[PDB]
Amino acid sequence: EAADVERVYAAMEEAAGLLGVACARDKIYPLLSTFQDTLVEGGSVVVFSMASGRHSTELDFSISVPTSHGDPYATVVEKGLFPATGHPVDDLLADTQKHLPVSMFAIDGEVTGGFKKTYAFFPTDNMPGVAELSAIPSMPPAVAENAELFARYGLDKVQMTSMDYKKRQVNLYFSELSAQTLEAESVLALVRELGLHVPNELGLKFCKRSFSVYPTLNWETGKIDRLCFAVISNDPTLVPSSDEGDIEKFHNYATKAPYAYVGEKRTLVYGLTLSPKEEYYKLGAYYHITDVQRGLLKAFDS
């Protein structure tokens, strides 16, 4: 439906407008048209994410794609929207769906850069572990090489994975996080073992409220590139930053981002990313939600 396409793109321009970013129509429209059938409201999930620091001038968008549509990456490459990288990341999404049960896909891009990643969601009642994922042929070796470290901190079940074709990286979104996993002492030992920025009192408090945690890995080495803690809430003032700018800019976005489910508050997902020499924050404001998001809010934002 050309209608849903225009609408989704307009909302995307709105979100970008809030951060002073311009959408590259030539890179976005073709992508939205290709999966236009998935833009239907109801069972679709769409997110527009902002970030701080060196990411403050970009705006990401995520769109859920039903598995029935087939490998979303093969589609973008076949249509000529993106050039295969020639690396294992090209087959990872396909191999993941082949070896494990995938409940749904998702495409991700940046308003000025275009397409850059896909996601593979797993059934909540049938989530794979570190061992099941590390056995995927195209999966980065780093996953298996860090298996002992993951198990030591209670990172077992994975609710989904994401593949970044431009940076050739993979994220493992751990779920069912225990309390001792998110304890201050545990989080500190973990970051130190990975050589990432040490979170302060404020950051640690945010890590404790996390419902999801995801490390980023690559095919070059067995070293984790960064680690992210995600919190989901309806509260627009949670950005874990002490900078006046961030507090103001994030809260503004959280209260003005577009959303197609009037009648409820905006679902928000905040992120605290720790890299070797710094930390940055991100915030995704959902444009479209489903009962999954509602279920999560009841469980982690009560």
Ligand SMILES: CC(C)=CCC/C(C)=C/COP(=O)(O)OP(=O)(O)O
């Ligand atoms: C359709 C749905 C429900 C999408 C959810 C996407 C999500 C939780 C992304 C987290 O990664 P990121 O956006 O913070 O960045 P990166 O992958 O680059 O680390």
Ligand SMILES: [Mg+2]
């Ligand atoms: Mg992003």
